[PDB]
Design a protein around this ligand. Sequence first.
Ligand SMILES: [Zn+2]
Ligand SMILES: [Zn+2]
Lengths: 185, 613, 651
Amino acid sequence: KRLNETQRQNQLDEIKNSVGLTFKKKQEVEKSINDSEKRLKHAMTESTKLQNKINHLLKNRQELENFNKLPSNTISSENHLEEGSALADKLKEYIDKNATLFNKLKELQQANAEKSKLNDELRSKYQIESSKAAESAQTLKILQESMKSLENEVNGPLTKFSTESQNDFQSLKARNKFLKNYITL
Amino acid sequence: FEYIDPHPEDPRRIYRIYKILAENGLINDPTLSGVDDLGDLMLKIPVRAATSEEILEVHTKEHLEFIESTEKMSREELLKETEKGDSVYFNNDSYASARLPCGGAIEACKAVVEGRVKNSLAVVRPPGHHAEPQAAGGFCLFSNVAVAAKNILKNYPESVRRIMILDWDIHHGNGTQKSFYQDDQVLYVSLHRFEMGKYYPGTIQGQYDQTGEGKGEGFNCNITWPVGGVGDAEYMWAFEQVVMPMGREFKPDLVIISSGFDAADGDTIGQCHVTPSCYGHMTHMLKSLARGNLCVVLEGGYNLDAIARSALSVAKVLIGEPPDELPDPLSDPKPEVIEMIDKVIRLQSKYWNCFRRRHANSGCNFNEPINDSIISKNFPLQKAIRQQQQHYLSDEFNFVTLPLVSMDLPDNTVLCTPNISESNTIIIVVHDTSDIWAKRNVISGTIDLSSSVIIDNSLDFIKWGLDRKYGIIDVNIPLTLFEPDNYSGMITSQEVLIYLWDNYIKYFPSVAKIAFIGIGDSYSGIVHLLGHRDTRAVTKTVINFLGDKQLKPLVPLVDETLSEWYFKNSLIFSNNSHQCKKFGRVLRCDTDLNNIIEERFEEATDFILDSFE
Amino acid sequence: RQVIVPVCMPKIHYSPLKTGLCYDVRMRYHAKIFTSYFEYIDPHPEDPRRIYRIYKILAENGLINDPTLSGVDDLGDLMLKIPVRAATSEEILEVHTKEHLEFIESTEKMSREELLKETEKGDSVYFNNDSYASARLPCGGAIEACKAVVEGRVKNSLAVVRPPGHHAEPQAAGGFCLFSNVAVAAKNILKNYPESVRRIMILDWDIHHGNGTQKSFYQDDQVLYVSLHRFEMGKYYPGTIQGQYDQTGEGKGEGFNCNITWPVGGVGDAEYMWAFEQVVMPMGREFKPDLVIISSGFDAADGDTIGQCHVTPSCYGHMTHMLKSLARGNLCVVLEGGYNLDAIARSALSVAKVLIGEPPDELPDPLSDPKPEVIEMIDKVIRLQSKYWNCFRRRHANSGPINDSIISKNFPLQKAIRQQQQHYLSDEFNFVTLPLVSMDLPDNTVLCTPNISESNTIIIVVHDTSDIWAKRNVISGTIDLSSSVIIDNSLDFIKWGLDRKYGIIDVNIPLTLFEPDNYSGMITSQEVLIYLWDNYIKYFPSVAKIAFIGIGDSYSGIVHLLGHRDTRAVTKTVINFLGDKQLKPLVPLVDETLSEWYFKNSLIFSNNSHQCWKKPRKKFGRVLRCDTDGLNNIIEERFEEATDFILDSFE
Ligand SMILES: [Zn+2]
Ligand SMILES: [Zn+2]
């Protein structure tokens, strides 16, 4: 019973340690996902501004192209479209990595949320069993009591036949203020 | 989800210490589970649940009803009792977890007294040095040691009658003290940080003058570490100074320890530096003290490595191995520590015999509270000095008193020439009490009156300025008076200076050229008032006969040219064995306090007259 | 189920071993030669009989397994035998000169009478034909015990060894030693192990001075020499200035020699406890030795006729315990003295039990309150050693000449106390200041209860100015004056008498400043006493049952009033609380039966440490010796016996 008890108690210890671990790891990735979201905001402002470049310079393309007399502005315009697309590619890869960070946070959070209640349940049923453990211990205690009373009685000056019949000082003879405690006139 | 930072009262504390011994061959139980066949140096003792009779010997019935009722409470009710206990957490399984420490304690103690083991150790939790007989408090549910000790005394009236309970747990043993605060057969001591409300628990019961009550007087002790960061020095120091003489005086039949290694080196709730070798050497002294009777109970320790190493050292000392060597035998403990231990040994001399005639305390008896009445034979002496000078100056130069109203100081603290409000020039001598040179008798502490050499050096400038027809302001700040035990000269001086400057000196019609003289350490209060107010309008200069005292660091609170004006208008004569911009013209004087006063008076008075023109 | 920490051996160093023992029957034949019948009635200064008496007491307690009591190798379970071998001349010459080796060499091959003249000639020594090999064996046994301890063959050793070696000097022998055993072994270990054994701390509690061992390392810094003994320079052996406490080394060994001298014999448990508690442990931990050698001597034990001390065998165990705490576990014990075989037997038994590992017992008397002389003696030692070591500075205000012209400028302090005194007296007891006209004295010399001319019982209490207890600060030097108290000592009696409706008269007489004995006070006392008696006492009609109370001095006035008048008809008791003062002899002039009435109706309480009883006469008048010192203590102590004799003396 104490074998199973100590296994469950070490189990409970490892559980509480693990809840600490998961909430710890989650709490540290919070600030990471926060900064990642801020760079995502920056990257979205970047997309918007690059699209404003795309829009005004495509307007200017339309202004110059009909019955051409072709200036060099349309090549720069198309180059700005390429820059906006490349920056869009970059922010898209980035929001993907951002999403990876966020979902790992969320699953860790979920594990952390269920772990506490799991610990509480193990605690509850641990109390249920440990009650019966304690009372059974008390039964074995009174059994010990019975055995030593019997044995102590039969051991000393004993009944009329010898068919069956110091160090360490058990017979209250530890000489630290015992005999000298008596009156002795 | 605060499981990142769990509770300092933790289950691992038992298991960790149990592990450490099995790593050193002391325990030959490999699986770290409670068995009987431990090994050859020690002997395992079973732990049983304490009955209701044992646990109600000290505790009240309502307490047991509450702890028995909460054993099958609902979850939210447990939450309410957890948040309701003063840092005590309650949970579904709480009756047996609290009734097993007390039972284990009585087991270990009965094992020691019946001579079946040489001594015993009880790695145990929850603690019991914070549980009170009517309410739980401080991570503790039932006072284990009180239950155990009352069982030993009531059930063994033939071999044990006096017991010592020690608490080197850095938190004061609140619960274990009040149960035996009226008790005389037990001498309780607690080494702990006290820090007057700051440290845990921070209640009036933790003060160093809680020496028992009723017939329990002189049979209770609190050692109150003023500042954190004490180490092996102060521990061994207090052990030799207070513990061991009174220990060999009281002579117990049993010594019990409510130990805690929350003050061990490397701990966080304690923040102290007691190495486990200091633990082993104090354990050695306690082994020397009694005839061998010892039991240890675990209360503190919330750093697993500190408590584990400390426990391993103490366990080696317990098996029979002598103590190892300390980190530093040349450490020279803190002055405040020495003064606190002195004030302890004072009242202990007032009670016990072993601290007088070997510590020069047999002269006067401190059991008479020092009074001017006839109830006590003792009489204060600074009162006599001040009364003599008051009578003297009153019939002599008609020196009137200035009532320092709304402050707790005698009428003749400030002495003044009459009509001080019309003095065109006001000299303000912020002086200090005289000094003697004689040989104190080492056996009694009493002195001689036929060769007493006391000089009233602070009267020279008074008569000098009196001849100048300058208004003289004599102020007497004494040095702790030996009576109140909490008088602080510096802060009181600062208050008197603020008070007089804001209530009287700022209103005077003909006030001009206020000088300032400070003799000895009594000059630092001037630094406060100068730094806190703009006074240089009427102030011309400031003079200091520092003697051998350390310099006073001027930090100004109103301007920065105070330091310039101060350093320009300050002469601060110092010791020749002193050698030590904001200090204000440190002058390393030649002859040596009285020496530099009668020698540099001429320099002082002449610079006064030139600055005054 | 998982085995996490595999089973291992215990990791300890102290007590898997046994306690080393050096013993040999080959060192009990260096004996004296018969000279006179006086030798039959004297304690035989260094007798061979010391060995087997202790050795017999050992086997009776099971610590060694030997019912035959002879040299074996199976010493049992708690102790290990260490064989002895004759030390070669090289180890001996490590300390001594070359003429002393040849001296003991020549000594071996002498006749009987030349050895007799050598016994007579030596500085308290005696030679023998078997005194050459029997002198080489001690040093060898000592070196074997130290090698056994240092090389860890035993946890510690103990050596039952004679002749001594703590008196033999490097130059020549003197002091019942032949070869210096401690010095030889110490120098051979420092020469044999100067990597592990680098600092040695030698201690001496033998009541003679270890003069030879002092000189051997007086210029040595690796060897901390400490000696505790009685000096008594005039008579007490050795009678050398090397035994004086100021021998604190020389050269590089400065601060590495220490003599601790007892001003007087009679010392017990509390003295040695207090001393070992205060001094030896800080300098020992600061000196940090790698080996502590013990020069044991049980010639100052309880039951010894030469030491005349009363040290019990428990304190020995306590000191052994402390020394075991001091070092790293390495300890060696060599025996030097002893005169009474039973005391040395029980003491060596206790020391050996503590050495095996048993804890020291509790002392038979924890309360003796040590004699005043040794206190200031150790203060002076602390001054020197604070100058040398640091652990006595900054904690005892030592940190390693007042004036003679400012004496004209002094704060009076007699009249101030008497004035304040007068004040609080009159404000609670309404005393009448009595004017002694035609006499130049302070107005508050005498204060009496009002309507003194009608009270029959008149108690006249004469005393000097009151006592003062002051606090000296420990942080830095001098005394703190503002933290001083006025010990009014004569207050319980005035109140006591007023509770029984008596005429109470207070008398103060000030002290002659800068004066050893208040002789002018005694003169002024006789003036006040005679004058008051003539001018005032004989004119009050209703007077009966006068009792006097004297505190300290001023009792010459009472002595003069008794001898030079006849006033015993109305007074019935004189009482002085002398304390420590010198005795005032009564000089009777009116008649002689006045002196016996004086001697009869008297009670005087003088201190334990007073000049007498170390036998006064009857002209002092039946003094009594208190058990405590101090005037305040004895007055609060015997306040009840005094009022009992007063009420018994009256109706
Ligand atoms: Zn605590
Ligand atoms: Zn000797």
